[PDB]
């Protein structure tokens with residue numbers, strides 16, 4: 001049972017450490033609709049994004065308590081897990097604000 005707490009437009013990127021380059025998540029350049037989903041049973045939150053064109057899930061990652069969410073610019077935000085670096089290149093500042101708000105809220109209530 002998952003409730004969407006936000007939707008934002010972004011091109012989801014992951015960092016290729018070996019080549020020191022951002023690459024499109026899922027291998028597919030383009031914009032996705034990126035949700036934060038809240039599972040109320042255990043108060044968990046995940047980032048789940050699907051490409052606008054073909055619906056591919058290109059990101060599905062946990063939001064752990066204590067995450068450092070970096071707002072590098074008004075339209076490019078990023079964070080890390082133990083394996084990967086993620087970046088969201090938002091379609092607008094408004095989308096970056098919506099998503100950052102929801103993320104920051106999740107991080108306050110975890």
Ligand SMILES: CC[C@@H]1C=C[C@H]2CCN(C(=O)[C@@H]3CC[C@H]4C=C[C@]5(CCCN5C(=O)[C@H](Cc5ccccc5Cl)NC(C)=O)C(=O)N43)[C@@H]2C(=O)N1CC(=O)OC
Nearest residue numbers: 013015021022068069070072073076078079080085086089
């Ligand atoms: C895809 C378009 C994109 C858009 C905008 C700009 C904004 C700046 N920018 C970057 O990639 C910035 C520039 C410096 C470089 C250096 C390192 C990187 C990459 C790896 C992670 N990182 C960290 O700075 C992390 C952050 C972090 C801090 C705290 C907590 C979590 C995290 Cl993740 N610092 C650690 C220590 O992990 C990084 O983001 N970098 C983006 C960018 O140029 N482009 C264009 C492009 O790539 O065209 C070729």
